[PDB]
């Protein structure tokens, strides 16, 4: 019949409440994995004391066969991924391990192959599956939430991961409007389309207000001098120029990029929907965002290329000579420009200024240039405002 997004199929694994985030993540693994759980839950103490690497090297190789459902496999990825970052970087002062012991590398790679995700911590692990409600009968607010794992005391990982998650959830409230958009275009329902675009804009405007909470829960000194170390990967990294050896799984060292919000499917989703061709051309920013799709869960990666197969919303609006429809489309693009402009100020506070008192991103190239290119591509998609 063809690529028609008239409904969001349950096979895309997009939750009605939390969107691309993992709904009600599992907190405990079966008892068989207690040795992994003790290490993952005590990374601040084990790293600070210099005992982390020895505790990891003492592990027996545990089979992944006892992780029988999706949520336990996602929790185990988050546990193994946090342990791997702590093992590779240690205290973060130049003494790096270039070989991941087989006792963790083998189950980590087996589980990563099973979930079609690389054997490195991704945004879907440390943001989308790394959370819980303190009280299940209370709403999804910062006060009623916590992360499952942190790297070091005072690293601000709770604030950084949770505010990223909250923004991600706020933007997700617009996903349910996508089938209304495609259906209104197919059925030539102008008023329905206009109303749907304004609702998407409203959601993206609310996501910016949610972002303001970053200042209360993250401090620049801790983010840049402490958390930054554990967010780093091994692709174009001079500290691990050939990548990491996953002992017992692969013969040669392998390179994988560190976790990135370029792996967020909700932001890539609205750029695709609005025809902001962030992945077009052969430039660095476009190549990076396309590359980050292979670091997203497979159903979410599938949702994005499915959106790309649908008719263009931008081309539909551009061809109508309808001021009301063009304004509603621009309200969506404007809300993304506003988010990106505010995020540039956040990056200046949390990265640029601390770095100046001491910038390359996950892609190995200047992060300010990447962000400004992404923002500029969005601003240039406005049909009028200039
Ligand atoms: C302490 C605050 C923050 C800092 C320092 C920060 C830093 C960065 C950096 C360095 C990048 C470039 C990509 C990379 O190198 O991995 C990036 C991209 C991005 N960030 Fe953040 N970020 C912050 C907060 C947030 C929050 C709360 C969100 C909400 C989900 C967010 C969403 C994004 C998105 C979607 C991108 C991809 C580029 C774009 O779509 O404009 N960031 N961020
Ligand atoms: C030179 O100094 C630095 C360079 C940097 F690249 C970073 N860095 C990288 C990320 C990453 O993209 C990220 C993540 C990941 C954990 C998955 N999660 C949420 C998020 C929101 N926006 C970005 N997010 N955030 N900061 C930090 C640095 F200090």
Short mmCIF file of N, CA and C and ligand atoms in Angstrom, two decimals, residues 123 127 156 159-169 171 207 210-215 218-220 223-224 227 231 258-268 271 278 288-289 292 336 339-344 346-352 359-368 370-375 378, ligand 1:
data_model
loop_
_atom_site.label_atom_id
_atom_site.label_comp_id
_atom_site.label_asym_id
_atom_site.label_seq_id
_atom_site.Cartn_x
_atom_site.Cartn_y
_atom_site.Cartn_z
N UNK A 123 22.55 7.36 24.56
CA UNK A 123 21.47 8.23 25.09
C UNK A 123 20.26 7.35 25.55
N UNK A 127 19.87 8.07 29.56
CA UNK A 127 18.79 9.03 29.71
C UNK A 127 17.44 8.28 29.67
N UNK A 156 26.53 15.68 39.11
CA UNK A 156 25.33 16.28 38.49
C UNK A 156 24.70 15.39 37.42
N UNK A 159 20.78 15.58 37.65
CA UNK A 159 20.23 16.76 37.01
C UNK A 159 20.34 16.73 35.49
N UNK A 160 21.51 16.37 34.97
CA UNK A 160 21.74 16.36 33.52
C UNK A 160 20.87 15.32 32.80
N UNK A 161 20.89 14.07 33.29
CA UNK A 161 20.09 13.01 32.69
C UNK A 161 18.59 13.29 32.82
N UNK A 162 18.15 13.67 34.04
CA UNK A 162 16.73 13.91 34.29
C UNK A 162 16.14 15.12 33.55
N UNK A 163 16.86 16.25 33.43
CA UNK A 163 16.34 17.41 32.71
C UNK A 163 16.29 17.09 31.19
N UNK A 164 17.28 16.31 30.67
CA UNK A 164 17.28 15.84 29.29
C UNK A 164 16.03 14.96 29.10
N UNK A 165 15.77 14.04 30.04
CA UNK A 165 14.61 13.16 29.99
C UNK A 165 13.31 13.97 30.02
N UNK A 166 13.21 14.95 30.93
CA UNK A 166 11.99 15.78 31.03
C UNK A 166 11.68 16.55 29.76
N UNK A 167 12.72 17.15 29.10
CA UNK A 167 12.56 17.86 27.86
C UNK A 167 12.12 16.88 26.77
N UNK A 168 12.79 15.71 26.71
CA UNK A 168 12.49 14.63 25.78
C UNK A 168 11.00 14.22 25.90
N UNK A 169 10.50 14.07 27.12
CA UNK A 169 9.10 13.71 27.37
C UNK A 169 8.15 14.86 26.97
N UNK A 171 8.62 17.16 24.62
CA UNK A 171 8.55 17.21 23.16
C UNK A 171 7.72 16.05 22.59
N UNK A 207 8.31 22.47 25.86
CA UNK A 207 9.61 21.82 26.07
C UNK A 207 10.71 22.84 26.45
N UNK A 210 10.46 23.62 30.14
CA UNK A 210 11.00 22.49 30.89
C UNK A 210 12.53 22.56 30.97
N UNK A 211 13.18 22.98 29.87
CA UNK A 211 14.64 23.16 29.80
C UNK A 211 15.20 24.11 30.88
N UNK A 212 14.46 25.16 31.25
CA UNK A 212 14.94 26.14 32.23
C UNK A 212 15.39 25.51 33.56
N UNK A 213 14.84 24.33 33.94
CA UNK A 213 15.22 23.61 35.15
C UNK A 213 16.68 23.20 35.19
N UNK A 214 17.39 23.17 34.03
CA UNK A 214 18.81 22.78 34.01
C UNK A 214 19.66 23.54 35.04
N UNK A 215 19.40 24.87 35.22
CA UNK A 215 20.24 25.71 36.09
C UNK A 215 20.19 25.30 37.55
N UNK A 218 22.30 21.39 37.72
CA UNK A 218 23.63 21.11 37.19
C UNK A 218 24.49 22.33 37.43
N UNK A 219 25.73 22.15 37.89
CA UNK A 219 26.65 23.28 38.00
C UNK A 219 27.78 23.12 37.01
N UNK A 220 28.24 24.23 36.41
CA UNK A 220 29.27 24.13 35.37
C UNK A 220 30.57 23.46 35.77
N UNK A 223 29.93 19.65 36.04
CA UNK A 223 29.63 19.08 34.73
C UNK A 223 30.90 18.93 33.88
N UNK A 224 31.65 20.00 33.74
CA UNK A 224 32.83 20.01 32.89
C UNK A 224 34.03 19.26 33.49
N UNK A 227 31.60 15.11 35.25
CA UNK A 227 30.75 14.31 34.39
C UNK A 227 31.29 14.09 32.98
N UNK A 231 31.20 10.76 29.86
CA UNK A 231 30.36 10.87 28.66
C UNK A 231 31.22 10.55 27.40
N UNK A 258 30.82 8.27 21.73
CA UNK A 258 30.24 8.39 23.06
C UNK A 258 28.78 8.79 22.98
N UNK A 259 28.04 8.66 24.09
CA UNK A 259 26.61 8.97 24.09
C UNK A 259 26.37 10.40 23.69
N UNK A 260 25.29 10.68 22.93
CA UNK A 260 25.03 12.02 22.47
C UNK A 260 23.54 12.29 22.38
N UNK A 261 23.11 13.56 22.65
CA UNK A 261 21.71 13.89 22.41
C UNK A 261 21.42 13.98 20.90
N UNK A 262 22.45 13.89 20.02
CA UNK A 262 22.23 13.67 18.60
C UNK A 262 21.56 12.31 18.38
N UNK A 263 21.56 11.43 19.40
CA UNK A 263 20.86 10.14 19.38
C UNK A 263 19.40 10.28 19.85
N UNK A 264 18.96 11.49 20.25
CA UNK A 264 17.57 11.68 20.64
C UNK A 264 16.71 11.56 19.37
N UNK A 265 15.75 10.65 19.38
CA UNK A 265 14.86 10.46 18.25
C UNK A 265 13.78 11.54 18.20
N UNK A 266 13.41 12.16 19.33
CA UNK A 266 12.31 13.14 19.30
C UNK A 266 12.74 14.43 18.56
N UNK A 267 13.98 14.88 18.76
CA UNK A 267 14.46 16.07 18.03
C UNK A 267 14.69 15.75 16.56
N UNK A 268 15.26 14.57 16.24
CA UNK A 268 15.43 14.21 14.82
C UNK A 268 14.05 14.06 14.15
N UNK A 271 12.60 17.47 13.12
CA UNK A 271 13.35 18.01 11.98
C UNK A 271 12.90 17.30 10.69
N UNK A 278 18.20 18.25 8.12
CA UNK A 278 19.42 18.20 8.92
C UNK A 278 20.37 17.15 8.43
N UNK A 288 27.03 13.44 11.00
CA UNK A 288 26.96 13.09 12.43
C UNK A 288 25.55 12.66 12.86
N UNK A 289 24.52 13.46 12.50
CA UNK A 289 23.14 13.11 12.87
C UNK A 289 22.68 11.83 12.20
N UNK A 292 24.35 8.98 14.11
CA UNK A 292 23.75 8.77 15.42
C UNK A 292 22.49 7.94 15.37
N UNK A 336 11.55 25.26 17.46
CA UNK A 336 12.83 24.52 17.39
C UNK A 336 14.02 25.50 17.38
N UNK A 339 14.48 26.64 20.99
CA UNK A 339 15.10 25.58 21.77
C UNK A 339 16.60 25.56 21.50
N UNK A 340 16.99 25.60 20.23
CA UNK A 340 18.41 25.52 19.85
C UNK A 340 19.22 26.75 20.27
N UNK A 341 18.59 27.92 20.22
CA UNK A 341 19.22 29.18 20.64
C UNK A 341 19.44 29.14 22.16
N UNK A 342 18.44 28.65 22.94
CA UNK A 342 18.58 28.56 24.38
C UNK A 342 19.68 27.51 24.73
N UNK A 343 19.67 26.38 24.00
CA UNK A 343 20.66 25.31 24.19
C UNK A 343 22.07 25.85 23.90
N UNK A 344 22.26 26.72 22.88
CA UNK A 344 23.59 27.36 22.66
C UNK A 344 24.05 28.16 23.89
N UNK A 346 23.15 27.51 27.02
CA UNK A 346 23.44 26.49 28.00
C UNK A 346 24.85 25.91 27.79
N UNK A 347 25.18 25.61 26.54
CA UNK A 347 26.49 25.06 26.21
C UNK A 347 27.61 26.06 26.50
N UNK A 348 27.35 27.37 26.28
CA UNK A 348 28.32 28.40 26.61
C UNK A 348 28.56 28.41 28.13
N UNK A 349 27.50 28.30 28.94
CA UNK A 349 27.65 28.26 30.40
C UNK A 349 28.34 26.98 30.93
N UNK A 350 27.95 25.81 30.42
CA UNK A 350 28.39 24.55 30.98
C UNK A 350 29.66 23.99 30.38
N UNK A 351 30.01 24.40 29.17
CA UNK A 351 31.20 23.90 28.50
C UNK A 351 32.20 25.01 28.15
N UNK A 352 31.82 26.00 27.34
CA UNK A 352 32.78 27.01 26.87
C UNK A 352 33.47 27.81 27.97
N UNK A 359 36.38 23.54 21.80
CA UNK A 359 35.73 22.44 22.53
C UNK A 359 35.30 21.37 21.53
N UNK A 360 35.78 20.13 21.69
CA UNK A 360 35.41 19.06 20.75
C UNK A 360 34.22 18.24 21.25
N UNK A 361 33.28 17.95 20.36
CA UNK A 361 32.11 17.16 20.73
C UNK A 361 32.29 15.68 20.45
N UNK A 362 31.19 14.89 20.58
CA UNK A 362 31.11 13.44 20.34
C UNK A 362 31.59 13.01 18.93
N UNK A 363 31.44 13.90 17.96
CA UNK A 363 31.85 13.62 16.59
C UNK A 363 33.31 13.90 16.28
N UNK A 364 34.08 14.31 17.30
CA UNK A 364 35.49 14.63 17.16
C UNK A 364 35.79 16.01 16.60
N UNK A 365 34.73 16.78 16.23
CA UNK A 365 34.86 18.13 15.67
C UNK A 365 34.22 19.19 16.61
N UNK A 366 34.55 20.48 16.40
CA UNK A 366 34.06 21.59 17.22
C UNK A 366 32.55 21.54 17.47
N UNK A 367 32.17 21.43 18.75
CA UNK A 367 30.77 21.30 19.10
C UNK A 367 29.99 22.59 18.87
N UNK A 368 30.61 23.79 19.03
CA UNK A 368 29.88 25.05 18.79
C UNK A 368 29.51 25.21 17.33
N UNK A 370 29.11 22.69 15.18
CA UNK A 370 28.04 21.72 14.94
C UNK A 370 26.69 22.31 15.36
N UNK A 371 26.58 22.78 16.60
CA UNK A 371 25.33 23.31 17.12
C UNK A 371 24.79 24.52 16.35
N UNK A 372 25.70 25.45 15.96
CA UNK A 372 25.33 26.64 15.20
C UNK A 372 24.88 26.27 13.80
N UNK A 373 25.49 25.22 13.19
CA UNK A 373 25.08 24.73 11.88
C UNK A 373 23.68 24.14 11.98
N UNK A 374 23.41 23.31 13.00
CA UNK A 374 22.08 22.73 13.21
C UNK A 374 21.03 23.83 13.44
N UNK A 375 21.36 24.82 14.27
CA UNK A 375 20.44 25.94 14.50
C UNK A 375 20.18 26.75 13.21
N UNK A 378 17.88 25.10 10.81
CA UNK A 378 16.50 25.23 11.30
C UNK A 378 15.96 26.64 11.00
C1 LIG B 1 24.26 20.99 30.89
C2 LIG B 1 23.47 21.12 29.79
C3 LIG B 1 23.79 20.71 28.42
C4 LIG B 1 25.02 20.66 27.79
C5 LIG B 1 26.37 21.10 28.27
C6 LIG B 1 24.75 20.12 26.47
C7 LIG B 1 25.75 19.83 25.52
C8 LIG B 1 25.56 19.37 24.22
C9 LIG B 1 26.61 19.15 23.24
C10 LIG B 1 28.09 19.28 23.49
C11 LIG B 1 25.98 18.76 22.08
C12 LIG B 1 26.61 18.39 20.76
C13 LIG B 1 26.50 16.89 20.43
C14 LIG B 1 27.53 16.02 21.09
O1 LIG B 1 28.74 16.45 20.95
O2 LIG B 1 27.26 14.97 21.64
C15 LIG B 1 24.55 18.74 22.37
C16 LIG B 1 23.55 18.41 21.42
C17 LIG B 1 22.19 18.33 21.67
N1 LIG B 1 21.59 18.54 22.90
FE1 LIG B 1 22.50 19.21 24.61
N2 LIG B 1 23.43 19.89 26.29
C18 LIG B 1 22.80 20.24 27.48
C19 LIG B 1 21.46 20.04 27.74
C20 LIG B 1 20.47 19.49 26.88
C21 LIG B 1 19.11 19.17 27.28
C22 LIG B 1 18.54 19.35 28.66
C23 LIG B 1 18.52 18.67 26.15
C24 LIG B 1 17.19 18.06 26.08
C25 LIG B 1 16.89 16.86 25.65
C26 LIG B 1 19.49 18.70 25.09
C27 LIG B 1 19.30 18.28 23.77
C28 LIG B 1 20.27 18.26 22.73
C29 LIG B 1 20.00 17.86 21.36
C30 LIG B 1 18.68 17.36 20.85
C31 LIG B 1 21.20 17.93 20.69
C32 LIG B 1 21.45 17.62 19.24
C33 LIG B 1 21.64 18.89 18.39
C34 LIG B 1 20.39 19.71 18.16
O3 LIG B 1 19.33 18.99 17.84
O4 LIG B 1 20.37 20.93 18.22
N3 LIG B 1 20.68 19.20 25.57
N4 LIG B 1 24.32 19.12 23.66
#
